[PDB]
Amino acid sequence: VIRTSQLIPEMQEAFFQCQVCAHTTRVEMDRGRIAEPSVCGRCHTTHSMALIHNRSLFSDKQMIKLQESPEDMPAGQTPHTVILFAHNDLVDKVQPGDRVNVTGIYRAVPIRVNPRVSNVKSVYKTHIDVIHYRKTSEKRVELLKELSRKPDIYERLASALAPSIYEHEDIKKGILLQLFGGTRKFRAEINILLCGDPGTSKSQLLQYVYNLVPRGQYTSGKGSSAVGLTAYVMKDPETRQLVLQTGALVLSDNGICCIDEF
Amino acid sequence: NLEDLKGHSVREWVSMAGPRLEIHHRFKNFLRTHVDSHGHNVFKERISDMCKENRESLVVNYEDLAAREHVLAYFLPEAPAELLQIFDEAALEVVLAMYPKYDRITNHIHVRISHLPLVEELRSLRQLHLNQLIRTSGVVTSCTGVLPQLSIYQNYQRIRIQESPGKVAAGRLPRSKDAILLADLVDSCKPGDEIELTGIYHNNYDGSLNTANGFPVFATVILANHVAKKGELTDEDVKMITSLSKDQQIGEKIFASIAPSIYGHEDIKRGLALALFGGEPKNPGGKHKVRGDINVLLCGDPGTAKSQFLKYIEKVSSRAIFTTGQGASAVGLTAYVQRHPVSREWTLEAGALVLADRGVCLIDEFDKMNDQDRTSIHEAMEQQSISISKAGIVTSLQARCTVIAAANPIGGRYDPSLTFSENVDLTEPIISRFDILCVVRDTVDPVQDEMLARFVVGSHVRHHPSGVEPLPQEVLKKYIIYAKERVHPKLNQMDQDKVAKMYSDLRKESMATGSIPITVRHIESMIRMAEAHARIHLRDYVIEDDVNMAIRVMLESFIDTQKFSVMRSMRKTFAR
Amino acid sequence: NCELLATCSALGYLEGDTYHKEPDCLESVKDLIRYLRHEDETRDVRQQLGAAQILQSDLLPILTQHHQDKPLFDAVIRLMVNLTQPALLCFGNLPKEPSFRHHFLQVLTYLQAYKEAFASEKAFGVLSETLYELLQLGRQEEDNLLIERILLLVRNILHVPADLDQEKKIDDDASAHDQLLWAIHLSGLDDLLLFLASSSAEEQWSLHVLEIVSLMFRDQNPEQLAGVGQGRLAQERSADFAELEVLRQREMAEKKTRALQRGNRHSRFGGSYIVQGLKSIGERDLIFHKGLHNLRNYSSDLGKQPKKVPKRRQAARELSIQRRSALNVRLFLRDFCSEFLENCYNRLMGSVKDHLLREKAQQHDETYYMWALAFFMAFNRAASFRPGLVSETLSVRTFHFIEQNLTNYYEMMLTDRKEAASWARRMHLALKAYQELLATVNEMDISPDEAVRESSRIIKNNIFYVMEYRELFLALFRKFDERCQPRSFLRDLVETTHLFLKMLERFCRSRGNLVVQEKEFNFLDYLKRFACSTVVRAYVLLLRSYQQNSAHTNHCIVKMLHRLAHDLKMEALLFQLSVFCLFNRLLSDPAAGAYKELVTFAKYILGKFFALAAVNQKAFVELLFWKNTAVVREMTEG
Amino acid sequence: RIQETQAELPRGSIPRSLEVILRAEAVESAQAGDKCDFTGTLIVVPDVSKLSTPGARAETETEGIRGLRALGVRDLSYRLVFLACCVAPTAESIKNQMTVKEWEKVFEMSQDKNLYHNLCTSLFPTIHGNDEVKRGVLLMLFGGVPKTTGEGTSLRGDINVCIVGDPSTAKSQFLKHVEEFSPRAVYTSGKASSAAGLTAAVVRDEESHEFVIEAGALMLADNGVCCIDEFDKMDVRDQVAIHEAMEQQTISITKAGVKATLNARTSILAAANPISGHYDRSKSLKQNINLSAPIMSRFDLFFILVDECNEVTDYAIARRIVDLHSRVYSLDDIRRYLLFARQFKPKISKESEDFIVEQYKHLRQRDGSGRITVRQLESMIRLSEAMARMHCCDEVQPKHVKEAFRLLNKSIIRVET
DNA sequence: ACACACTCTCCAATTCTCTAA
DNA sequence: TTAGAGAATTGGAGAGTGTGTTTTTTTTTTTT
Ligand SMILES: Nc1ncnc2c1ncn2[C@@H]1O[C@H](COP(=O)(O)OP(=O)(O)NP(=O)(O)O)[C@@H](O)[C@H]1O
């Protein structure tokens, strides 16, 4: 997945009311065409029936954009893409960057040459009409209680961290203590610093502990980093309205933030 | 009775024949009968001045209109487009009654209202105010050319005004509105002006807004009726001004009336007074122009009221600008070039020295500018122009201003063991462009401390929210604007031998100590100071007394440049 | 415009709350009269005076504060009597010309404003005090004229209609008419109406009081008015919550039926089906493009728009709607009505009948007299007081009088095409009053008194022996028309027919045979006259609105229909495709449980139809067409 | 335009935003950055550019609806909007808010004995020792009456205070504590976290490549209190701008496309470190610190904090800390009383002038005998008036002048010695 | 070249009136 | 009593007319 639109409302049943005598009628609608009344049947006055937008009945729709995954590409080429439409229940179930399997109906539609004119082009545009898609306890408490009541549990829990690293036990203990933390005036949480030569396993250790905690974040002090430490304001690429982009430090509130090339 | 509002809106009521005629007669009778506190007719004088200068535009004050004919004052803001029409019709026949031939000059006269009490802020306008007379303030940012508009044809111009900077809250953004200027109001303003605008609030349909918002929302604009910045002296004003000039001690009264709350410092007040009135520019033979303005520099110890004097000068004068040290750039001081927002071409715009023009440009922390910014003012201070050649543009602009500056001595305190040049650290091409130079120092006399402290304590109890006698500040303001506009001193003769001998001797000594170098500029400076003293006395011709005053000021300010031990010998050398 | 607006100012001016007249105000109002005396047929001076708002601005202060000058008071009263005269009387009709229509509407607008302005109780108070003084004289012609013009002034004020379309008020709120009526009570002016109605020598004024009283009560029907009582607050509160509940429930149910009928997938999901074997209008099978669920209730016409009717082809419609006034007004009206019936009805009716009989050259409006007896008899019967309270009207002369008036209206409606609508309205009013007479004689039969029962037999005997009453219903049914009368007339006519047949049947049971104007009577032969197929068409039209018809209406029509079909054996006259369409809709509606008699009768007659159709296939043709009596009887023979 | 609040945004998601519409009496009741609750209804708005009417024409990967007369042969599309009928945050005012309980409390405070020390204890309960600092910082909250001279120039109201000390000790505690207590206050440092820093700056707006201003800390702290940490280390650009901001209480800009005067009316409380970390007890403050004489001469009061490792003192501090972790007037009483006190505008008495001028003369001749400027006389007036205001006295009686002189004299003596 | 808005015309549907079945 | 033919008024089916429609050079502030 690459991008997901805002939610789009869609008409189902139009509500018409007479300006002259307030008589009302409902029109079930036909593959996008509305059968507008010509005359009010009660008061026999032509061109007097008006569509009431907020009394009509609506449904939800969303537009999703998807790309072929990098594994199945021919060598050195750029990837292809398709457009998916999802209705009602399915209308908000995926987010950018993740990967899915989708089943749907392969539709094709003509397009108009200009918004005023009624001529259509001779080459059609196709899209997928989505039908289904798939992404690719007391027992635990008692186990935890028994394990906590076992001796040298502090050493054991520390030992469990980063099995690729064979000797730095007290560093693992410090990291474990940071993950547990104090409790709530004064700053209750803990901050730790790792120093020494480049090429040492410290970055791997950051990436390991980052993957252990739900509210975690990871970035670099270099300007090439994917997300900044500083909050800023920018124009939305879709609407070109302003949006406030908070930095990694804010997002990791009540969480751990790993910083590299500090 | 005109007040009998029944069964009709006021717009409908004043449309009726009976009420229209009553309003017409009441305004006409008000024009002929209105009297000042002295028993003088006000509008006889004002109409006669309008006719003598062919100006075709009559100003009325809301306050005394209300005070004498309240019923009309009550209707006026509720239906302005009706009562203003009736008022125009009534004024023209009074003018023709007094001056029967004036229809040869014009066939219409416009009445303009002033001092309307119900001022509103530029962001507090609401639909409650539509089609009523209002008053607001702001600074002009955009201003079209003057164009002709159908009616016959008349002048038309459109402007955009926004909230004055520093009246918006910190870090947020200003609101703005559009206004329309018709007939004699065009070129009553230019970009960067701050103005007071009285007008009618008016709205109309616009399809662009309806399609942009999706709701049936209208656009609005202000029709201007009177515009004024935030001479018109009466006979009584010029009479009192001219009568004051008879006093042989007028110099003491004017000098003692500058920055009144500052105790002591006689020399500073005198120097600032001469710079405030100024000498006269001239161009003998057409090929040799020379400037009129008198520049001033102040330097000395901290806590001696240097910054305070500039703020007073900013308040008493008109067309004044104030700026500080690192807060200004070379480009901001002179003029700048930009890609124009809507014309999409390179354009040139005025900086501080151009925007001030025939006014005062005040600088503070002059010691702490970047040197590359401070050297931008050399042309404007002497040649009195600003020449630019950038981005295909090649042009020059007027820079006809007076510069006043304040600085600190090197290391924070002045040493009398060293000369001015040794203590200030400014180069000769800068030092020589200031006409008056002053040095201010700490002193430690106990009686002077007691007097100063007692005066300051007295000042604090005096201003709680609750020498000769000085003038009221409004009288002094009237005096300055009269003197600069109605008197132009002529130098018909003076003693060349006396000045030449003194100058040669002075220059020779300046070579000896090197405290300041003395050049041709000093002679021309004394001519400027002599004319300024002549102007303070409202005299058309320079006389012997003026030349002696100029020489005294010049030599007194020069002796202070020297080392303490040398000053005694120098003072005895130049005995006057 | 400006000329009148400038000159009319002369009357005076207002100082806070004290009004100061000008010293020549009398001459000034005389000049206003001189303006009106030379006014245009467009009523331009009246529109100008209205625009200047002279009546509201000056005349009300003059009447309230300066009435001590009796000549000035008289001048002001007569001036505003001329100004307030109803627009229909001023123009003579609602104009056809658009310019005169605009002037009429503007004049009526100013009259509406005057009616609102007159709501101040002080005016009615001064008027009542003045009138109280005048009646103490037991007088000069000018005194009689002042009484006359006072009565006509309040008449004119009451007469101009309220714009319910402007007000759009909810029930139990006060309209302009309601507030003004309450002001009549608050002024005590009503007491003088009851004096004038009850005092014998004031008969010349009683005719005017009839118009005043009948103008007041227009919005309230006597049955619901008799219903009111002090506990109505909680009753309306609780009932309104229940009404709101059922309304919400109905909308929910209907929504869900539509929701199930529609498919679940979106409107562009597509698909197409062939209905194999079902041929088109063309040579081949139908192709169906809509959703699968729609075939469960398919009819091919669902895609078609209705036929566009011509302008002049439209039927008549009601220009009025049911209402209820504020509870304070309802209580006051009930008290006044009770006191009028207690003191004034018989004396006023005798006086009005005397004037209508004597004064034929004056062309007094008989419809008010019939309205008043129709209203007060219904109120009296709803309260079930003794018949003695309405004694004067309980005589044969009333039946003959209203029969000749109603038949005159019928003949005029047929002959006088240029006014047939108004003649129909007059005829409808007469029919309503006649129905109340029948209800009254029916009620006294179930009284405990033999004397009034014998009087009832005497009246009913004359009504059934004479031709006119038994022939009249058939005469009205024969000439009912959709342009001529709205369906309300048909409802009243058929319900009155049911009541007439009920009393006729009860009267026929008294002897072995009834003889009438001369022939031996037969009830079944009389009912055979109603077997005309036009009458059945009118009945079927009234049946289309059975859900909106009253319970009594539905009972009456279905009872008469079953009797006519079953006992006369004319059943096949009801075998009609239009009727069968209505039966289909009837049995389809889930609300059928409320209409047991109607659905059982429908299934019964359809059973007869299918029993015949099983033998004879020609019934499918006969179903399209209306039957002559001979055809109805021949269909069973085959 | 509104956006999802920080509490709702699901992890990894981009924020969603919505258009809200306000009408009639609710207009301009919310500013950018505010967090509010809105009540109303969700509605559907058509594309008005494609409809046509007798009054006005139509202007002109999805499709809209079709088949209305007003729409011709075009197609119509909708969008979602939220119509809000109500919005709320998520001298006479004192009379309206203070009940009889609050009136009784401020009256009891006005009648209190040794109220000065009681308020010091109440506002700074955590602090140990250092009463002079507590008295000095407490007086700053009461300010001093500003005055406008008849010719239009104005005289400074706020006092400014400076604290120098060793990085190990109390100076940081005062700043963060008063900031937590006080309304409408700003914390910052000479090593500021923005391009603006302590005073306004110019930035080019990419929406037009046009130059505009951006606010610094002293603009936002207008009409409030400003706390500056590590003040000994500061940018030169701000240091020059501070010269004007300290006394003139304004900021002046003159650069390409921008010319303005901006307000900076503020009371400053500054914290600084001496050279080599620990204060040299043998040397004056002016020898110890980094600040220049022009900036240093601006402050009305100075104080010095330096540690020494006394065992009992260390043990007491440790026990205080651990006991605090183990666990007269409330802060709202101080707030209510302070807002009550700041409405008084006491005058100086005629007799007080003699004492004031005498004390200034004594100080000046002492300075001349072994430098003091006119600014010190102003500070005497400001401090004494603040004392009178804090006791809610009607005029500046001599008892206030004596203590004000004592504080100033002790500060200057320990600055010099 | 292909869509709205407006103006205008002629053909024949609906009702009145007189007549025969 | 029920139904068809000749004359008058009116609706609307249909035609005609007018109009609209990323990629380069230069400046200014502040970051280095
Ligand atoms: N003689 C005086 N009379 C009245 N007020 C004075 C006097 N001398 C100093 N002050 C006050 O001292 C304060 C500082 O004034 P200011 O003009 O900034 O002096 P300064 O020498 O320019 N200080 P600085 O800018 O650091 O060199 C102001 O409040 C002045 O009003």
Ligand SMILES: [Mg+2]
């Ligand atoms: Mg200064």
Ligand SMILES: [Zn+2]
């Ligand atoms: Zn309708």
